[PDB]
RNA sequence: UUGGGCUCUGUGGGUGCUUGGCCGCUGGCCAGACCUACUUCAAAGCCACCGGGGGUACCUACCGGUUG
């Protein structure tokens, strides 16, 4: 501990201690007045240590190094299962005069179709950054005498919109060239479909299935070649009151019917028959179904998850890879059962990516909760009581799975950012 | 000029510029704070709240560029001669100029900072250090450091004395060197070189409450503490990010407040003028950090009109008190707590002016013929989107007119954490206000 | 109620004068 | 007590040192004759029980540990002083394990907020609180029990809390720095947790060094993957090993490649890593060739994946075979 | 608007017009320090707040005396 540099000016310097009043009390005897600079600075050291005693820091490990690192303290993802970086964004300025019938997202661009039982469709672009009207209205199209029940985007590229309500006929609007088709005949089934109410379009945009107004012991429905708009097939299962809901698989070759009393039937096109039947466990009557996922059983369409919502109000979610025994478990077991809403669930929907599951009931104020896959639990920190949802009626994920759109029965759709 | 209105004062201001404050202890009961308006300097009380004790008159003709306050006098250097402005240094006492400092005629440099000790004052300009004998207020010498490079000769960071070293100054180069010069003979006696020389410049430096140890803050990032006669490094710390250099540092001399027990000393506060945050380290075992204070002011941004920063830190004499003056016209004095442990201090004093210009300006009508009166309260609607009731009488009794528990709202959210920011949470800016105290019953 | 910081006071703490560094 | 007034003068240390016996009547009597205004601010939770004499339960103490950090702070300080003075004992450390585990469990169980920078900053403050004790217990070399307890708390810290990869690897690094052989297999379980909840695919160096130092690697790894899913750990291992240009890791590489532990994707990308290592290398290549012919002549699905990976990289196994055999 | 309310407590400001903390101050200090000197002449009187009627042995006071 040798001192590196030295000075000669301190040995040259001397100071008068007894003359100095401040320095007077630093002597050792009553004889030290003229004191050299080196001894003077030494007495300064003694005075300073008497003023303040020396500290212990004045007397490597990995996390100690991380700890002293301050770059360790600086201020869409895949998302963790109990909370969400969720952010309510700007609201759609245009309202609906009637209850909201449906929402639909365009698969390429952030384009949103809102649809109301006031016989009215709106198209908007998602733009929080718009001025002076964020999320601008593209279009407001009204269809006479025809309250819209449900509409679908047709095309994986998303080019057409079909829409169908309480009338016996439906329409296809080609956006390019803007043409309308009024389909009104399913080739010998014109006593057989007194509505056009429920329908689903394949993910490949190829097949349209329409449910039938003939319940009588079992649901039936017709598969349609979409580009030709023709009857191509029919599926019919034996139940009690006909079709509850239904959905294609991830391929667009086979599909699933859930009918009331909770009976789910898989049906492939290449065989043109029902793959099989099983029971949603203990559900006394279903009302909603949905199908989603990836990396599932490819022979059953490669989708991972099936969502069943029953008229009691319980939500049964299953894995189709566990549905296998091409043989079928007649009594499958619940991957996850959901008792977090009282009344019958109104609408449920899968995320495109296969992570999130939104579900809600409409009789209660704002019955909507959110599920992470494959942990299959709720997100316990959204939505609040004072999250302004409304008596929910329609729920759509965005194409890129960043945006949530919801709509109550009052005509007020609202939007959320799903940040992971 | 004009024929009716004479200039009286510029208000709405406690510390908006970049110049740090200077702080002296009076007795064992008060602390004087001294801050520059930009055309004057005020001195506040600490114990007696944060009211204004001294206002500096007369006005300097130019923007002040340096200051320090001794036992009685206020030494203020003003003037960047590089663009027109005449420069000088003045000596005030109790708000009034008693003396003026004789500048060297060959000073074409703005004068950076000021230090006083012994019988000498030293003043660092840009790369040049001038000395006056304080006992006579007379020019003594001028220190000229030398480097091989036009860059490296720059005197960034600053200079300090050690408490126990006779007549020795410690300066930081634009290179990572610290130079010790004896001011009595005016001779460069020693220099110390930065370890791991990837770090570029000494951005700051400060003596510790222990003897003969200097802490050096590097623009390349390291905070080091070293013996200054042994040239013996005590500790390295990787705290400065590359483009986010630290601004300055201070140690806790209050005697306790580390080791998580309350039973330990040696805490460092540091801060960066890139942020609005400050940082707290327990220096004993590994020099660990313990606590981040997040957004103690508004951090500076060029995308936004908001103005702010952190111009300084200081631990005062031996107490839980720490001052931070920012650039957001902003002082908030913080306080260490005893009965629990706490990572951070909580606020205990505040004064604020805006972080943006004033949009609208209005007076209050008289308490109809009384004292609250014509000339007491002036409402100011600032482009920082806020409303302030300024007191012409006693500037401390001005206040904000809050919009609620807005800061706590931000803290529950993340406006203070890391979306919009706090001005975007407060209501938009102010077109035009009108007042009427014809019912305003207090 | 516990956990509470008291009325803030000025503490007495002696300091070193650097004016003797001449 | 009756001579040195210890109940009055050393309330905190006495209170902590009988605190882990919270269901015995001796502790009840101590609670009976303490002075209330002398109980520490951290310790003022027993006030309902000192109004009503009854042994308080663990749920109460730990709930105070959750929404009162400083209780944990004080009990951490006592028990680390105990192990630093080498007077640790199993009842103490078992109590302290339960305390830290449920404590930090509850701490995350609130600290998850949903707001982004809020969860980051809360994890920051949490780390600042748990820092010293967890480091001292991760590398507390004399006390294996507190090593196991530190393993426990940092393991739950990993698996529950969505921590950042650098902090996770720093935990890995101090554990690597600090384990022993009695603590060996549990520390392996911790690294399975750590790398399994890691997001990046590689390990940082000295971890791989000490895992070479691990004696029974693939046997222990099969034993743990019997219940623990060690795949990300094995993948980070083989990435670090092909990154290292040392040639003493090759028996380890061969054994882990035959171990049937990594995924087919992990196996093919590791094989392409090994052949790009053979392409970048400038004997050494002879060892690489012997290893690569062993892997290409592997029997089962590991060899099948290796051969199909050769098929998808479209480079000639015969070329490198004859180049190393000639 | 990715939880919120009542209720209580704690801190700071201001509830009046912005000139220092201390001292043995035309000066000094804040780390203080020095500590016990020097000496020509006691004082002018007055005022001075007790609840009412009533008694006065003893005490106090006033006045007027008396021995020494």
TrEMBL record, chain A:
Cellular compartments per GO CC: Pwp2p-containing subcomplex of 90S preribosome; small-subunit processome
Any GO BP: rRNA processing
Keywords tagged on the record: Nucleus, Repeat, rRNA processing, WD repeat
WD repeats: 392-420
Protein location: Nucleus, Nucleolus
Family: Belongs to the WD repeat UTP18 family.
Protein name: Uncharacterized protein
Native organism: Chaetomium thermophilum (strain DSM 1495 / CBS 144.50 / IMI 039719) (Thermochaetoides thermophila)
Section covered of the full-length record: 132 to 618 of 618
Automatic annotation (TrEMBL), chain B:
Domain (WDR36/Utp21 N-terminal) ranges: 33-337
Superkingdom assignment: Eukaryota
Name listed for the protein in its UniProt record: Putative U3 snoRNP protein
UniProtKB/TrEMBL annotation, chain C:
Domain of life the protein comes from: Eukaryota
Membrane-traversing stretches: none
Subcellular location: Nucleus, Nucleolus
Secretion signal span: none
Role description: Required for pre-18S rRNA processing. May bind microtubules.
Family: Belongs to the NOP5/NOP56 family.
Name this polypeptide is given: Nucleolar protein 58
Lineage of producing organism: Eukaryota, Fungi, Dikarya, Ascomycota, Pezizomycotina
Automatic annotation (TrEMBL), chain D:
Subcellular location: Nucleus, Nucleolus
Domain of life the protein comes from: Eukaryota
Subunit structure: Component of the ribosomal small subunit (SSU) processome.
Record-stated family: Belongs to the HEATR1/UTP10 family.
Role description: Involved in nucleolar processing of pre-18S ribosomal RNA. Involved in ribosome biosynthesis.
Official protein name in the record: U3 small nucleolar RNA-associated protein 10
Organism encoding this protein: Chaetomium thermophilum (strain DSM 1495 / CBS 144.50 / IMI 039719) (Thermochaetoides thermophila)
Boundaries of the shown chain within the full protein: 122 to 458 of 1802
């Amino acid at each position: 501990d040798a001192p590196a540099w030295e000075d000669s000016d301190d040995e040259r310097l001397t100071i008068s201690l007894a003359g100095a009043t401040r320095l007077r009390k630093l002597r050792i005897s009553e004889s030290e007045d003229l004191v050299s600079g080196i001894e003077y600075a030494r007495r300064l050291r003694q005075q300073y240590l008497r003023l303040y005693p020396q500290p212990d820091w004045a007397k490597p490990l990995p996390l100690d190094s991380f700890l002293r690192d301050a770059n360790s303290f600086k201020v869409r993802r895949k998302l963790r299962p109990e909370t969400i970086d969720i952010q309510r964004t700007r609201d759609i300025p245009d309202t609906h005069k009637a209850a909201i019938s449906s929402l639909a997202f365009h698969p390429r661009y952030p384009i949103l179709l809102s649809s109301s039982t006031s016989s009215i469709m709106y198209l908007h672009k998602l733009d929080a950054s718009a001025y002076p009207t964020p999320n601008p209205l593209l279009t407001s199209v009204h269809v006479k005498r025809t309250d819209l029940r449900r509409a679908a985007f047709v095309g994986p590229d998303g080019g057409e919109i079909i829409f169908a309500g309480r009338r016996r006929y439906f329409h296809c609007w080609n956006l390019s060239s803007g043409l309308v088709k009024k389909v009104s005949k399913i080739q010998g089934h014109q006593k057989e479909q007194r509505t056009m109410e429920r329908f689903r379009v394949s993910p490949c945009g190829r097949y349209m299935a329409l449910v039938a107004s003939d319940k009588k012991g079992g649901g039936m429905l017709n598969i349609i070649n979409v580009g030709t708009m023709q009857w191509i097939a029919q599926a019919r299962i034996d139940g009690r009151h006909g079709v509850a809901d239904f959905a294609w698989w991830s391929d667009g070759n086979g599909l699933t019917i859930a009918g009331r009393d909770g009976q789910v039937t898989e049906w492939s096109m290449i065989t043109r028959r029902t793959v099989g039947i099983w029971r949603d466990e203990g559900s006394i009557g279903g009302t909603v179904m949905a199908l989603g996922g990836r990396n599932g059983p490819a022979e059953l369409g490669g989708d991972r998850w099936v969502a069943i919502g029953s008229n009691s109000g319980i939500l049964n979610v299953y894995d189709r890879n566990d549905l296998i025994e091409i043989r079928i478990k007649k009594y499958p077991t619940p991957t996850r059962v959901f008792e977090q809403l009282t009344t019958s669930i109104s609408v449920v929907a899968f995320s495109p990516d296969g992570q999130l599951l939104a579900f809600g009931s409409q009789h209660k104020k704002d019955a909507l909760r959110l599920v992470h896959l494959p942990s299959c639990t709720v997100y316990r920190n959204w939505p609040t009581e004072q999250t302004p949802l409304g008596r929910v009626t329609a729920i759509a994920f965005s194409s890129k799975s960043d945006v949530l759109a919801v709509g109550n029965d009052v005509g007020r759709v609202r939007l959320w950012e799903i940040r992971g | 000029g004009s024929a009716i209105f004479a200039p009286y004062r510029t208000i709405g201001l406690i510390s908006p510029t970049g110049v740090p404050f200077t702080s002296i202890p009076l007795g064992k009961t008060t602390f004087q704070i001294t801050t520059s308006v930009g055309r004057a300097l005020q001195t506040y009380d600490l114990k007696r709240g944060l009211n204004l004790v001294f206002v500096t008159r007369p006005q300097t003709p130019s923007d002040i560029t340096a200051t320090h306050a001794w036992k009685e006098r206020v030494y203020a250097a003003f003037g960047d001669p590089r663009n027109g402005e005449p420069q000088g240094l003045w000596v005030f006492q109790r708000g009034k100029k008693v003396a003026e400092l004789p500048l060297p005629s060959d000073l074409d440099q703005p004068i950076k900072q000021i230090l006083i000790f012994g019988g000498w004052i030293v003043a660092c300009a840009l790369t040049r250090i001038e000395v006056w004998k304080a006992a006579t207020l007379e020019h003594y010498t001028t220190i000229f450091p030398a480097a091989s490079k036009k860059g490296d000769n720059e005197l960034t960071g600053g200079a300090i004395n050690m408490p126990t070293f006779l007549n020795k100054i410690f300066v930081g180069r634009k290179d990572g060197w610290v130079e010790i010069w004896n001011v009595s003979t005016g001779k460069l006696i020693y220099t110390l070189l930065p370890p791991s020389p990837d770090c570029g410049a000494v951005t700051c430096l400060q003596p510790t409450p222990a003897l003969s140890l200097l802490a050096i803050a590097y623009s390349g990032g390291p905070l080091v503490i070293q013996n200054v006669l042994t040239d013996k490094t005590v500790l390295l710390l990787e705290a400065g990010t590359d483009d986010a250099p630290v601004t300055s540092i201070s140690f806790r001399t209050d005697g306790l407040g580390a080791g998580q027990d309350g039973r330990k000393d040696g805490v460092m506060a540091t801060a960066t003028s890139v942020s609005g945050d400050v940082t707290f380290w327990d220096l004993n075992k590994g020099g660990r950090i313990m606590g981040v204070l997040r957004s103690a002011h508004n951090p500076p941004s060029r995308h936004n009109i908001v103005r702010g920063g952190i111009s300084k830190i200081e631990f005062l004499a031996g107490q839980p008190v720490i001052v931070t003056s920012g650039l957001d016209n902003s002082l908030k004095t913080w306080i260490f707590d005893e009965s629990p442990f706490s990572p951070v201090p909580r606020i205990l004093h505040q004064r604020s002016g805006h972080a943006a210009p004033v949009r609208c300006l209005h007076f209050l009508p008289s308490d109809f013929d009384g004292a609250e009166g014509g000339n007491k309260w002036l409402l100011s609607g600032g482009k920082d989107r806020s409303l302030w009731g300024w007191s012409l009488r006693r500037d401390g009794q001005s206040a904000e007119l809050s919009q609620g528990a807005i800061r706590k709202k931000a803290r529950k959210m993340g406006l203070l954490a890391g979306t919009t920011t706090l001005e975007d949470l407060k209501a938009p800016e102010i077109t035009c206000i009108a007042s009427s105290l014809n019912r305003d019953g207090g | 109620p516990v956990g509470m910081p008291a009325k803030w006071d000025v503490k007495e703490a002696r300091k070193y004068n650097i004016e003797a560094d001449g | 007590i009756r001579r040195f007034r210890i109940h009055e003068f050393n309330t905190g240390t006495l209170l902590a040192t009988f605190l882990p016996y919270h269901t015995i009547p001796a502790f009840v009597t101590l609670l009976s004759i303490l002075p209330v205004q002398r109980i520490p601010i951290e310790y003022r939770f027993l006030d309902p029980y000192i109004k009503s004499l009854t042994p308080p339960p663990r749920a109460a103490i730990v709930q105070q540990a959750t929404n009162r950090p400083d209780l944990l702070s004080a009990i951490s300080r006592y028990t680390l002083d105990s192990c630093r003075a080498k007077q640790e004992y199993p009842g103490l450390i078992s109590f302290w394990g339960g305390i830290m585990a449920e404590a930090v469990n509850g701490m995350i169980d609130k600290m998850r907020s949903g707001r982004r920078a809020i969860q980051l900053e809360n994890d920051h403050l949490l780390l600042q609180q748990i820092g010293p004790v967890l480091s001292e217990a991760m590398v507390m070399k004399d006390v294996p029990g507190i090593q196991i307890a530190s393993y426990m708390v940092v393991a739950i810290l990993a698996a529950k809390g969505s921590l950042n990869d650098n902090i996770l690897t720093a935990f890995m690094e101090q554990l690597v720095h600090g384990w022993t052989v009695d603590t060996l297999r549990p520390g392996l379980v911790c690294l399975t947790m750590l790398a399994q909840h890691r997001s990046a695919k590689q390990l940082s160096g000295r971890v791989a060094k000490a895992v070479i130092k691990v004696p029974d690697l693939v046997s222990s790894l099969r034993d743990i993957s019997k219940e623990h899913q060690v795949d990300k750990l094995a993948n980070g291992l083989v990435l670090a090993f092909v990154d290292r240009g040392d040639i003493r890791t090759l028996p380890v590489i061969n054994s882990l490649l035959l171990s049937e532990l990594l995924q087919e994707k992990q196996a093919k990308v590791a094989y392409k890593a090994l052949l790009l290592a053979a392409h970048k290398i400038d004997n050494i290549r002879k060892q690489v060739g012997s290893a690569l012919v062993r892997l290409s002549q592997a029997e089962g699905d590991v060899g099948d994946a290796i051969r199909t990976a050769i098929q998808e990289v479209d480079f000639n196994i015969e070329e490198l075979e004859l180049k190393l055999g000639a």
